Design a protein around this ligand. Structure first.
Ligand SMILES: Nc1ncnc2c1ncn2[C@@H]1O[C@H](COP(=O)(O)OP(=O)(O)OP(=O)(O)O)[C@@H](O)[C@H]1O
Ligand SMILES: [Mg+2]
Lengths: 219, 116, 73, 115, 128, 145, 52, 52, 73
């Protein structure tokens, strides 16, 4: 109504518009800091995959339980989600893809176990009734791989004990600065010279594969 | 009008068309006429029409006019800008940013408009 | 019939109706009404165009367009 | 609109509808700048019911049939109270909000949701 | 003579460059790697790795475990950020199992997930 | 520039000719679906089949409604544009060519079906014979021009 | 198999070249129509200017 | 050879469609100029008659 | 409390001595850059080096405009 109150509303919205314009540039700076951390993790995982591929081919007498598929009715998922809000559909599009793929297993009569990273994922399963077996939250913007050891071990032990038949990781892929793609990716069911294998080649494999799955979850 | 009747094309520059509108408001107030919306003279549209309708192209020659325009309180809906815009055929917008780049004349190609 | 797909399909006008044309300046208000007059030349409907407060040059251009399209008679 | 004239059931239902619509009105500017995702879980549930209530208040009239071809609908007070009470209590939380637009009675909203 | 060597962790590169000798603690015994060495893979126990180069004759780096991989023209240390052992490894898994907050034993067969996902996905479209 | 969302005629529905009255019922709703989805064209490649088809039809009807000044259309000419859009003949035509398709279709009926356009122009009547005559002409157009 | 492949390949290429010529003839019919309509339009326009 | 025959058949139809579009646009340009030729001629004669 | 963003003199540089005319050009630009970057000041640690260099200069020039009453220079 009055010309005094309208000026107060215009000033209130203008003050807000100044800080949202600043936060856009802050988000870009943090995006560049994250892109360099993605690139720094690649040279380790590609070398572990190269070693795993050679060793598994050079020693046919042994096949680790992760490299063979058991066709049974129980599955596991690692769900990656944010802790903070102000995201333009990041968690919503991810949960939509998770529910789409989970329903295929529910309809096929298969049971499901869940591992959760981030407060938004925890809130979704806490409100809708998801049976979470392991959870972690409040990790920094620059996470450390040692924080993931626990959550990944709980999910790996369940596969080694035969409780889980297949394990997947659900997260967003950086297609370009304007596009984030929600995806479900499988994990557990993965030149003519040999190494000296100082300790047992089978022992090395039992150790290298665990470091490979953890490096995939960290990436 | 004399130069137009000699068979020529003439340019008429008006320093500020807003001050012509205000001078009419001042004279109308001195004569005691009842003021209109926003306090402008009741004859606002007619006084603008009497001036602007003589500036045209005739069978002998033409008078083209370039008029500087001031917008009160940055409100394009105010009676003075709104009455003036009914008569304009083109709009040239000079830009402070374009002048900083050393580009002259400093005319904005996106904000300038023309009915032709 | 105004002769426009959008108007004759979604906002039909009947004989004896009052239909308001409304909008901001310079967006086709005159164009829509003059084209409606031009489309009546073979319909049997006679037309009246009243220009109030318009520039003399604008009125002259509307009359030129009415004869170029055969609607002035 | 007095408990001594219309009875407590109708009065509480009308009061409940006004409470939800008033609370949704207060969230207009927050929703325009940041969207529904930044609201609390209690506010998100209320916004979904407010949007269903706004649509369920619409009705095709018999005199308006000339403007749209849609048949007119007459709704009794019994059917009116039952429909809004059900929406406020959450009996239709699973129906999409477009199912309540231009439907005479709550049963017609249930049938429209199957399309 | 020199061979290219990189020490890399799951998070970032610790070292990268040319060296004449690499000395490390293997799980079965200590080793000395030089250019042209035959392909070798081994598990490393916690301790310092010593690199040798002209001038850089004592470049020492502490490593918490991991693996060493060797080739006649390349050396790779696939390092660890923290000591990996059962007594430390198990505590984190028990904490992850303990951190799983539970208030309602849901069946996971709910349809509501789809209704709320559609409600929010359409709201996020009106926002732009 | 006709804003279909707020523009309305209180007495024109009873005055509209039979052919335009029957074909125009789907035009009004298609533009409403477009106004609600138009901003999504930058991300619509990743939406459900139903919403994708509603948006794709709304875009075609919006493109079809464009018209130049001093270029009026007769009952028969407007009827071809409305029939092609209402009966789904534009689904395999790209947005950039809806205007080209319209001018080509009208030009084709003017030489191959002149007697049908003359019949429609008398009083804008719409019987089974006229409906059959229009679809046969549009199908032959799509399959040969 | 090689002979059958050449027969089917050659036969379908006949259809494509026959269809290409048919497409161009329909474009020539359209082209003649648009210049005929313009030539008759120009005849009525010159009649309008002379009467004016 | 069958893949190459399909690519040649596809090229033939796309080239025919491009040729058809050029034929129609050239005829549109001729049509537009035919009306301008008649208008300029009619205006010239009108000015000659009124001046006389 | 001079708002240099809207305050203006139509005479400009013609009313200045050679030394003040030369030294004021950079200061006018510095205040203009500061008015645009002022909202980002609470996040200076996350900005680009070139942007931070302009912001730091803008803050010092803005602080230098302060002066006490009855103390003309
Ligand atoms: N359908 C159309 N296609 C292309 N241009 C058009 C169309 N309709 C109108 N225009 C153009 O729009 C411009 C303004 O049109 P018009 O003069 O009729 O608008 P107006 O609202 O009546 O203007 P005014 O307020 O001055 O009377 C003109 O250049 C006109 O040629
Ligand atoms: Mg006008």
């Amino acid at each position: 109504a009055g010309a005094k109150e309208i000026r107060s509303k215009i000033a209130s919205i203008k003050s807000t518009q100044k800080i949202t314009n600043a936060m856009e540039k802050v988000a870009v700076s943090k995006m560049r800091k994250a892109q360099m951390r993605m690139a720094a993790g690649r040279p380790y995982a590609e070398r572990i995959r190269q070693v795993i591929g050679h060793l598994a081919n050079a020693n046919p007498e042994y096949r680790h339980p992760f490299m063979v598929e058991r066709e049974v009715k129980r599955v596991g998922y690692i769900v990656v989600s944010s802790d903070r809000g102000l995201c333009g559909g990041l968690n919503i599009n991810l949960f939509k893809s998770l529910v789409k793929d989970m329903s295929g297993y529910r309809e096929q009569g298969a049971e499901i176990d869940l591992c959760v990273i981030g407060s938004k994922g925890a809130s979704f399963f806490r409100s809708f009734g998801g049976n979470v077996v392991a959870a972690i939250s409040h990790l920094g913007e620059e996470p450390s791989i040692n924080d993931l050891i626990g959550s990944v071990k709980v999910m790996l032990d369940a596969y080694l004990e035969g409780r889980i038949d297949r394990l997947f990781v659900v997260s967003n892929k950086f297609v370009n600065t304007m596009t984030q793609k929600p995806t479900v990716e499988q994990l557990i069911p993965l030149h003519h010279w040999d190494y000296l294998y100082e300790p047992d080649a089978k022992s090395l494999l039992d150790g290298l594969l665990v470091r490979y799955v953890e490096s995939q979850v960290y990436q | 009008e004399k130069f137009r009747d000699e068979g020529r094309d003439v340019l008429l520059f008006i320093d500020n068309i807003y001050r012509y509108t205000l001078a009419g408001t001042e004279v109308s107030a001195l004569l005691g006429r009842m003021p209109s919306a926003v306090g402008y003279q009741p004859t606002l549209a007619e006084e603008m029409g009497v001036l602007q309708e003589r500036i045209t192209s005739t069978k002998k020659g033409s008078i083209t006019s370039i008029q500087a325009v001031y917008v009160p309180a940055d409100d394009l809906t105010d009676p003075s800008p709104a009455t003036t815009f009914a008569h304009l055929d083109a709009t040239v917008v000079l830009s402070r940013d374009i002048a900083s780049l050393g580009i002259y004349p400093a005319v904005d190609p996106l904000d300038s408009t023309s009915r032709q | 019939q105004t002769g426009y797909k959008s108007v004759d399909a979604m906002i039909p006008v009947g004989r004896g109706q009052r239909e308001l044309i409304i909008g901001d300046r310079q967006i086709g208000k005159t164009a829509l009404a003059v084209d409606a007059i031009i489309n009546q030349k073979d319909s049997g409907i006679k037309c009246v165009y009243v220009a109030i407060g318009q520039k003399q040059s604008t009125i002259a251009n509307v009359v030129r367009k009415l004869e170029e399209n055969g609607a002035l008679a | 609109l007095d408990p001594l004239v219309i009875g407590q059931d109708h009065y509480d239902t009308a009061r409940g509808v006004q409470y939800v619509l008033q609370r949704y009105k207060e969230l207009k500017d927050i929703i325009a700048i940041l969207g529904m995702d930044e609201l609390s879980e209690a506010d998100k549930l209320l916004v979904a019911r407010a949007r269903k209530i706004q649509r369920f208040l619409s009705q095709p009239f018999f005199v308006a049939e000339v403007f749209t071809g849609s048949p007119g609908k007459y709704v009794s007070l019994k059917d009116t109270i039952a429909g809004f009470k059900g929406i406020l209590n959450g009996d239709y939380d699973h129906l999409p909000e477009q199912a309540f637009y231009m439907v005479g009675g709550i049963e017609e909203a249930v049938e429209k949701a199957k399309k | 003579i020199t061979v290219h060597c990189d020490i890399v962790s799951a998070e970032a590169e610790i070292f990268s460059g040319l060296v004449e000798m690499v000395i490390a603690h293997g799980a079965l015994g200590d080793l000395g790697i030089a250019p042209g060495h035959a392909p070798l893979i081994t598990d490393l126990k916690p301790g310092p790795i010593r690199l040798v180069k002209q001038g850089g004759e004592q470049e020492v780096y502490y490593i918490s475990g991991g693996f060493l991989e060797v080739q006649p023209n390349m050396v790779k240390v696939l390092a660890d950020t923290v000591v990996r052992a059962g007594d430390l490894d198990e505590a984190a898994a028990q904490e992850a199992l303990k951190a799983a907050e539970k208030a309602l034993q849901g069946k996971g067969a709910e349809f509501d997930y789809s209704a709320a996902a559609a409600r929010l996905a359409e709201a996020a479209a009106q926002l732009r | 520039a006709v804003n279909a969302g707020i523009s309305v005629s209180r007495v024109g529905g009873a005055a509209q000719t039979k052919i335009i009255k029957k074909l125009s019922g789907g035009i009004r709703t298609a533009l409403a679906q477009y106004r609600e989805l138009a901003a999504f064209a930058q991300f619509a490649s990743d939406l459900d089949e139903a919403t994708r088809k509603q948006l794709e039809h709304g875009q075609r009807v919006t493109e079809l409604m464009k018209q130049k000044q001093y270029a009026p259309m007769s009952i028969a000419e407007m009827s071809l544009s409305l029939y092609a859009a209402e009966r789904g003949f534009l689904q395999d035509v790209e947005i950039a060519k809806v205007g080209s398709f319209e001018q080509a279709l009208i030009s084709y009926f003017q030489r191959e079906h002149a007697a049908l356009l003359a019949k429609i122009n008398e009083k804008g009547d719409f019987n089974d014979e006229i409906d059959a005559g229009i679809k046969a002409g549009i199908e032959k157009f799509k399959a040969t021009q | 198999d090689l002979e059958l492949a050449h027969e089917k390949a050659g036969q379908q290429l006949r259809e494509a070249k026959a269809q290409a010529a048919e497409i161009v003839e329909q474009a020539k019919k359209r082209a003649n129509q648009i210049v005929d309509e313009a030539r008759d339009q120009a005849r009525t326009e010159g009649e309008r200017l002379k009467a004016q």
